[PDB]
Structures are given as structure tokens and as C-alpha cells.
């Protein structure tokens, strides 16, 4: 009979959020935390709201803060004990309802880096897939697996202080994924844009990002590599390069972009 404490907030009432405790029999519940939340909703309090889809850990919609450390509820294991299990939404996020966070800023930041392959020459007729050796493809192994759960985003103290200026561990990891990719031909443009004091250099090497990653990726390692590459490759003409790309985006629709 484990005790579960769940963060609760009603957007209509707009009352002070509080922690409500539920008692669940682990015998009739699945091992994972998400199973307990579903059982609570099904049996005791159907008003509880939370984002869930996969059950495998691949989609990354069920990111939550369990016992003070971010994680995905579907992969997190229930640890029975006298101490109640505390479940809260992602830290320093605007809660839409109960455990459902407001991650719109995270999506906007991700769209900013333009995560799509860019090439100077369009695919010539009769040309098949772009050449890429196994060795080059191996460089992307630790970076293309991100599920965008935002556990790392909300565990970075620098993101707590400057959410609207700092891209965060997840978006910076993806930016280096396209920089590292051999097929992409806009490496200098991407490095020039990311070379900003707020966007990139707010990372202070705290490493709360790598610790909580559900998929075991290493955003801190990738962020460190990107800084080293930028420092070695900087040229006086990078600022002009950013401006020229901004002119190329003049006719784009509204939304975050390269500018």
C-alpha cells in the first residue's frame, strides 16, 4: 500500500497548487510510475491529468519530476517505502493542469536552429542518396536518439534563470548533431549563429543534463565539443555570414528561425 503524492492545480479555480496523497496497492499495479498514475485516475480521482502515449519510453511525452529528479514515468520504476512518492511536473515550467507542463518555449527554441539538412546544390537528376561513410555516420550515434522529452532542459540551472535566452541542453545537442553531420554543407552558418553568449555560453558545466537523460545521451559532452569547434574555427567574417543568411530568410512566414 504505497502512498503517492501528486501535484494538483486547477486552471479554472486558479487556487494555490497543493500536493494530494493517494494510497495504491502495488500488487494490482504495474511496476512503472505511469501505471500508478493511470490506476489512480481510473479508480480514485479521474480528474488527474497527465501526458502519456508510448509505454516504451520512445516518445518522451510523460516527462515528470519524481522525488526531485526528472525522468519519464513509463521507464521509471516504483520504489516502495515508507516515504511517500512525490510526483510533480517539470521544474520551473508553467503548469497547464495538474502534471501537464507548458513546453511551448522548448518547441520554439528547437525550431530556431532549423533542424533540416541544407545543401548548396539541389539534388541533380538521376542522383541517388548522398554518400556518407560508416565512420561519418558513427559520429551521429549519440545525438540522433534524442526524444525531446525535455528532462535535460528543465534540469539545467542556467535554463531556470534564462529560459527565453538560453537554448538549453536539448536544443544545443541537436544543433551540434547537424553541425557534425557530413552531408550538411552549412556548417559555418550554423556555428556562427550558435556562437552567442546567451544561446550557448550560459552552459556552466553543471552536468545535471547528462545525469537525468532517460535515453542515456550525453548533452554535456556534445555541448563541450561544439564550444571547442567554434573557438578554433572562428573568423572575423562570421557576423557577415549570419546577416546574409538572414536576408535569405526574408520571405519566410512568422515563427522562430535563423536570423
Amino acid at each position: 500500500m504505497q502512498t503517492f503524492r501528486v501535484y494538483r492545480y486547477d486552471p479554472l479555480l486558479q487556487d494555490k497548487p497543493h500536493m494530494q496523497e493517494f494510497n495504491i496497492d502495488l500488487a494490482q499495479c504495474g511496476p512503472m510510475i505511469l501505471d500508478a498514475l493511470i490506476k489512480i485516475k481510473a479508480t480514485q480521482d479521474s480528474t488527474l491529468a497527465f501526458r502519456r502515449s508510448c509505454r516504451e519510453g520512445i516518445c518522451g511525452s510523460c516527462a515528470m519530476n519524481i522525488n526531485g529528479k526528472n525522468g519519464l514515468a513509463c521507464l521509471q520504476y516504483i520504489e516502495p517505502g515508507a516515504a511517500p512518492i512525490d510526483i510533480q511536473p517539470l521544474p520551473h515550467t508553467y503548469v497547464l493542469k495538474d502534471l501537464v507542463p507548458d513546453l511551448s518555449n522548448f518547441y520554439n527554441q528547437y525550431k530556431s536552429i532549423e533542424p533540416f539538412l541544407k545543401r548548396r546544390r539541389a539534388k541533380q537528376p538521376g542522383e541517388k542518396e548522398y554518400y556518407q561513410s560508416i565512420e561519418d555516420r558513427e559520429k551521429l550515434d549519440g545525438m540522433y536518439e534524442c526524444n525531446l522529452c525535455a528532462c535535460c532542459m528543465t534540469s539545467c540551472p542556467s535554463y531556470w534563470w534564462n529560459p527565453e535566452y538560453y537554448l538549453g541542453p536539448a536544443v544545443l545537442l541537436q544543433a551540434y548533431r547537424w553541425i557534425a553531420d557530413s552531408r550538411d554543407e552549412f556548417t559555418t552558418e550554423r556555428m556562427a549563429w550558435i556562437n552567442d553568449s546567451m544561446r550557448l555560453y550560459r552552459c556552466h558545466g553543471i552536468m545535471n543534463c547528462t545525469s537525468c537523460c532517460p535515453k542515456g545521451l550525453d548533452p554535456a559532452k556534445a555541448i563541450a565539443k561544439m564550444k571547442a569547434a567554434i573557438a578554433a574555427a572562428y573568423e572575423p567574417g562570421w557576423t557577415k555570414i549570419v546577416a546574409q543568411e538572414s536576408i535569405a530568410n526574408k520571405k519566410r512566414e512568422s515563427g522562430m528561425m535563423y536570423a
Binding site: Y9, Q88, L96
Partner: protein, 48 residues
């Protein structure tokens, strides 16, 4: 009619890591140095 809530500071509850604490110490090295200089300066003026 509907408004979203803002959570408190994560510092009060978020779990700590050994590396995270050490980084704070790294950033506070100069602050401590200034503090010690001030203490010695005060002692040199008010003691003995």
C-alpha cells in the same frame, strides 16, 4: 478565465549531484578569496 500556474524555485527540492556541487565551489573560489582578505583586513585593524 483559465490561467497557468508558475512553480516555485527548483533549488528547494531538485536532487543534487556531486558534480553540480563542485561546479558551484569552482565558481565561488574568488568570492571566498575576497571574503578572506576582508577578514584579515578587519583583524589587522581591530585585533591586538
Amino acid at each position: 478565465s483559465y490561467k497557468s500556474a508558475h512553480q516555485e524555485t527548483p533549488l528547494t527540492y531538485y536532487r543534487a549531484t556531486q558534480h553540480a556541487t563542485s561546479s558551484i565551489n569552482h565558481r565561488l573560489a574568488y568570492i571566498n578569496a575576497v571574503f578572506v582578505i576582508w577578514v584579515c583586513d578587519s583583524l589587522n585593524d581591530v585585533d591586538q
